[PDB]
Amino acid sequence: ANVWGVRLADSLSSPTIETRTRQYTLHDLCSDLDANPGREPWKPLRNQRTNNIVAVQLFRPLQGLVLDTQLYGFPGAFDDWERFMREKLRVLKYEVLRIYPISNYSNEHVNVFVANALVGAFLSNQAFYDLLPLLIINDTMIGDLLGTGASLSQFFQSHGDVLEVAAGRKYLQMENYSNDDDDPPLFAKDLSDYAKAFYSDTYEVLDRFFWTHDSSAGVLVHYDKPTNGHHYLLGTLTQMVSAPPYIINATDAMLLESCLEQFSANVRARPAQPVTRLDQCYHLRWGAQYVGEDSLTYRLGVLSLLATNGYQLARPIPRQLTNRWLSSFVSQIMSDGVNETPLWPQERYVQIAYDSPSVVDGATQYGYVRKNQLRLGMRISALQSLSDTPSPVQWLPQYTIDQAAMDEGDLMVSRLTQLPLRPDYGNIWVGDALSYYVDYNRSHRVVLSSELPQLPDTYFDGDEQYGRSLFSLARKIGDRSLVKDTAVLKHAYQAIDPNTGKEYLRSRQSVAYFGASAGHSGADQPLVIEPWIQGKISGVPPPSSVRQFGYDVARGAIVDLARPFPSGDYQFVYSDVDQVVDGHDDLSISSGLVESLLSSCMHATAPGGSFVVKINFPTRPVWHYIEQKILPNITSYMLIKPFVTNNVELFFVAFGVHQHSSLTWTSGVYFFLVDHFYRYETLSTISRQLPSFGYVDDGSSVTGIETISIENPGFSNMTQAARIGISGLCANVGNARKSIAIYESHGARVLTITSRRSPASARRKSRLRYLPLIDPRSLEVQARTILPADPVLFENVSGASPHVCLTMMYNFEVSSAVYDGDVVLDLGTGPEAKILELIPATSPVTCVDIRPTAQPSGCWNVRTTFLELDYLSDGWITGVRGDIVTCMLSLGAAAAGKSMTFDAAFQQLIKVLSKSTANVVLVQVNCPTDVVRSIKGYLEIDSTNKRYRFPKFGRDEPYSDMDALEKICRTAWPNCSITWVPLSYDLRWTRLALLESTTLSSASIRIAELMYKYMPIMRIDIHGLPMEKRGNFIVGQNCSLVIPGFNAQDVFNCYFNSALAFSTEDVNAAMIPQVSAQFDATKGEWTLDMVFSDAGIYTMQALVGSNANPVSLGSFVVDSPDVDITDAWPAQLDFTIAGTDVDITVNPYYRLMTFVRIDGQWQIANPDKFQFFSTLVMNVKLDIADKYLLYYIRDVQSRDVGFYIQHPLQLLNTITLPTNEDLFLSAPDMREWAVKESGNTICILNSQGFVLPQDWDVLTDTISWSPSIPTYIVPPGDYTLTPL
């Protein structure tokens, strides 16, 4: 129901319950004159800002205030008023006693109106001690009040059998009033003249009388009998200026008050709502001869009888509804439009509704006639709570059937948008500490500076520079530089000599750094050094000395780093620079410069020295001259991409200055380089498409935030225009949950709806022919309210679920299989399956599921199809026709549904597809892709019955072998090309997510990557030639590959890492350890048999013909060595620093590390604290604190650490101890910890103010997790530890 400006109920809340009235007597009078402490008969109301009493409304009888305030007299203080009141009251008490004794009687009727005349006379400070017996009601005050002819014509005046007065006063404004937004108006009922009413006892004779009386000053009456009795009313020539912006003729004012009454009434509904009268309002007795129906007043009376039926506003209603609330209301209703209610009442008669729940009709006739014909009714509904919220909260569309016209909806929204405005751009991303480090290897082969491509000639143009800088300012992380130094030195700590079994770095040697900071708050240095000194970087032994300079620095007189200089030789060199003149043609220049860099480091270092370098530049001459002088003089080397953000950063470390060693380049490192190239290229390019921070969104993008608003959305059967607006919107912004805002401002109701625009929704817009129409029925429903809000670019600031991650991985994969002119079948689909947009729009598509659908259609340029039946059925596969198979989120899903073995259902599926046309077939696969390794948080493993388990998805799927798999593949069709489908090295799918505006990081990414590593898809083609496998793809164990045909005029390329490993044409760049790609001319068949060094997936591209026609051959997968290991653990307990020499039985493929469990920090212990030496043999060092600490050896030769074993060390954490010898006191932790000798204490280490006891011998150097923790030589006897 939306009348001209107002939106109300569409179902009633009107009760019928009433009570009986009071009768008045003597002790009634007395007690009313008692002003009961605690039961005082007034309500002193306030403002609503700090709620300070500024007015009162009275409870008659205390009224009778008829003349100017200037005679009243009373203070400006609340309490003062009341005490003066109480005083004068008890006075007049004594008085009325004088007149009538308290025991003269008990209780008896007296004209209240008379009592109020007395009230006024008293307070007026004027005499009334002459109207006294007139108080006593003999039988009917009517005759009593009318017996007199002339006395006190200033309260009451009698004309004929009539008495004519203005009724006693009800409100009073006080002396603190301020016309606040929180000042509800009394509507001038406190005036000394604002109304006049008139009684005798009866309608008819005065109805006669009125032919000689005004009506144009307002003739209104409430019928339902007061004890006041039969009376009519006229208003005066005054109107309220207040309540901007309205003049207010008290007629319509008191009407509005009656309206408020009826509203308050309609709020609740209880089978005993004990009013005495449901109805108190006033409908026009006379005045209908001066103004028509289009008046505000006629509107009001309409609403009067309406709410009398029980209708009610469709916005949450205050207890007291603000002055400005009222004016805004006016603003609304006064509008154009129509009534929901056909009725037009009459002074001829007022109607009685159909069956509105109220019984006032059940008692009265005077002015009442029902239309028995009436049938316009509603159901029943009210609410139990109404409030507000600030948040732009979600909503979901629920479509409808019909269509519309496109440009027309456009032109509709053309008056509704919120565009253009600047939104809160917010955050795009969060930093992430990734690393790609690699050092010298033996098992590799040589590599020349002839192989690595150089950076693109593109890198130096304004556009990409501004964009890369952007994202450098669009990702959340601190100064990368600190943790750079951190990680680089921490990994600059694993370098050991192949010939003496010890590292290269030594503590408290000479440390030098250049390229220092320029200061932001007073550092001029990488802060890392302070905690390095202060002992926060884990396990890193502090230095003795550090030299600190740069381009500009407050430590030592400066000279720029660009040219020669005198400086000392030190046991470490840190080298950095601030770029100066380096343009694409400053690179012969830049080369000479880096020569200068390295050469200075050379003649500035110690014999044996070693150092670091920042590198940036893929010019060959770099490595060229690098080889020309240095590698054959340094012990060894390592480098690193310490990635935090997009650029071509490079970092290297040289070992043993003056340590001649012919060093070169190798293969895997070079690939790694290319990998940086390819990825960072892709990532940078991904960034080439994004809005500018904080710009003003007018709408110029495929992507953005999209919102409009609405005043009073037509929630009657009329929705046409607004429905067009919203429909055009949602069609613009389909497939997302949409934020909403219900609020009123500038005297006007308005909802606001906010959303985004995406390239996905662009597909949406693209694939249509007409308009999806939406039912505001739901939007009709919610009576809720929402504060306004502000345009922010993003909705989620953190977090993600690997579920959706590998989902979109799958999505970009399948679209990356979604290609030209194909009708696909889709397995385990969504009733809300979004993918149909993602796919292009050229050829049909079918989805099938076991759960009913939820989506609209019928207005597209594209015929999409959905089938609600078990996608594990047939008899109809022959009824349908396709070529291409897509199973996702169904295989394990349908497995769980069927509770069977994998292979059984799989074979059933074979039978399913066994009936019609199929070109390529693809199914997400739950395939043992290796030995089970676990991932923590999301998957239990049932090796008893081989089942994957996922608590974060919270289910259990099975799995079965691989052999039977590929065997059944050959079974269905031996004629086939397999596809082990790999993707765990690329993130371009993630762009779509941030195209979907989804900020992420790498944690869940590698989560899902390990998941896919066993949970890939399989893509296979029935058109293909068998691949004839004989050997084993296990590292070092050979393979025999045999091939029927293919005359010798072709070549073939094995690829790895999306990178062309090598081919069947050259060996000088071959990569397989030993190859045999031979062609038997006699059988005319190929045989490629060989040996290996690397595991993983590798694929064949067949260069068939000699013209090099490239075709796709299947991929394959290779086994990395086992995950098992033993510890040749001796059982002897020796406390020597020679220590327990425990040995290791490890696969001939690996080498390891071992950290400390620092409250959730895998922090390697002190390097010295152990030895490692190749089965494998070690020599770790121990103290007492060990038994206090939990320990694990860690498989460590890569970045993706912890991926073949993790071994608890309890065979060392738990041992037996002697009592004959001194021990090594080392603390496990800095915590409060005391020492006890076998039931008699020793001391408290890590206690405030401790002093070393001479019983012990402190050790200049300590055995500890980090070199800041104390170690001692302690006498024999059983001590031990206890934390405070």
DSSP for 1046-1079 reads --TT-EEEEEETTEEEEESS-STT--SSB--EEE
Helix H or strand E segment including 368: strand 368-370
Cβ contact 62:29 at 8 Å: no
Please tell me the distance from the alpha carbon of residue 1189 to that of residue 1183, in angstroms, as a whole number.
Answer: 11
Q: How far apart are the first and last CA of the chain?
A: 72
Please tell me the distance from the alpha carbon of residue 734 to that of residue 763, in angstroms, as a whole number.
Answer: 10
Please tell me the distance from the alpha carbon of residue 863 to that of residue 841, in angstroms, as a whole number.
Answer: 9
Beta strand pairing call for 1125-1128 and 1143-1146: antiparallel
Cβ contact 806:764 at 8 Å: no
Short-list 859, 855, 815, 807, CA closest to 839: 815
Cβ contact 1053:1062 at 8 Å: yes
Helix H or strand E segment including 964: helix 963-972
Which residues define the annotated binding site?
892-899
Q: Which ranges in 635-758 belong to alpha helices (H)?
A: 667-687, 720-732
Cβ contact 1193:1152 at 8 Å: yes
How far from 814 is each of 824, 838, 894, 1021, CA to CA, in Å?
11, 10, 20, 15
Instruction: Give the single-character DSSP code of 151.
Output: S
Task: Please classify residue 22 by burial: count the beta carbons closer than 10 Å to its beta carbon, then call 0-12 exposed, 13-18 middle and 19+ buried.
Answer: exposed
Cβ contact 1215:1206 at 8 Å: no
Q: Which residue has the tokens 């890369």?
A: 468
Task: Give the count of alpha carbons within 13 A of 969, CB side only.
Answer: 24
Question: 814: how many CB neighbours lie within 10 A of its CB?
Answer: 20
Backbone angles phi, psi at 516, to 5 degrees: -65, 170
Q: Which residue has the tokens 């002992």?
A: 535
Q: Which amino acid is at 407?
A: D
Question: 579: how many CB neighbours lie within 10 A of its CB?
Answer: 9
Beta strand pairing call for 446-447 and 1059-1063: unpaired
Cβ contact 1165:541 at 8 Å: no
Contacts of residue 1013, Cβ cutoff 8 Å, sequence gap at least 6: 929, 930, 984
Instruction: Give the single-character DSSP code of 751.
Output: E
Polymer length in residues for the chain: 1284
Q: Which ranges in 403-555 belong to alpha helices (H)?
A: 406-413, 462-472, 480-491, 529-534
Task: Please classify residue 641 by burial: count the beta carbons closer than 10 Å to its beta carbon, then call 0-12 exposed, 13-18 middle and 19+ buried.
Answer: buried
- Strands (DSSP E) found in 1091-1213: 1096-1104, 1109-1118, 1125-1128, 1143-1146, 1152-1157, 1162-1164, 1172-1173, 1177-1178, 1191-1195, 1206-1208
Short-list 226, 227, 235, 151, CA closest to 193: 235
Instruction: Give CA 193 to chain center in angstroms.
Output: 61
Q: What are residue 12's DSSP bridge partners?
A: 380
Q: What are residue 1199's DSSP bridge partners?
A: none
Residues of the chain by 3-state class (helix, strand, coil), percent to 5: 25, 20, 55
- Experimental technique of record: cryo-EM
Angle at 1158 between CA 1154 and CA 1159, to 5 degrees: 140
Q: Is the peptide bond before 274 cis (omega within 30 degrees of 0)?
A: no
- Region of residue 1185 (left: phi > 0; alpha: psi -120 to 50; beta: else): alpha
Task: Give the count of alpha carbons within 13 A of 952, CB side only.
Answer: 13
Short-list 482, 486, 531, 532, CA closest to 507: 532
Helix H or strand E segment including 1225: strand 1223-1226
Short-list 554, 578, 558, CA closest to 567: 558
Please tell me the distance from the alpha carbon of residue 92 to that of residue 72, in angstroms, as a whole number.
Answer: 16
Short-list 783, 777, 762, CA closest to 726: 777
Q: Which residue has the tokens 């895998």?
A: 1162
Is the C-alpha dihedral spanning 1267, 1270, 1274, 1280 positive or negative? Answer: negative
Q: Which amino acid is at 864?
A: T
Q: Which amino acid is at 676?
A: H
Which residues define the annotated binding site for ATP?
892-899
Count of H-run helices and E-run strands, the chain: 26, 58
Cβ contact 657:611 at 8 Å: yes
Short-list 1190, 1188, 1182, CA closest to 1161: 1190
Cβ contact 868:851 at 8 Å: yes
Please tell me the distance from the alpha carbon of residue 282 to that of residue 223, in angstroms, as a whole number.
Answer: 7
- DSSP 3-state assignment of 955? strand
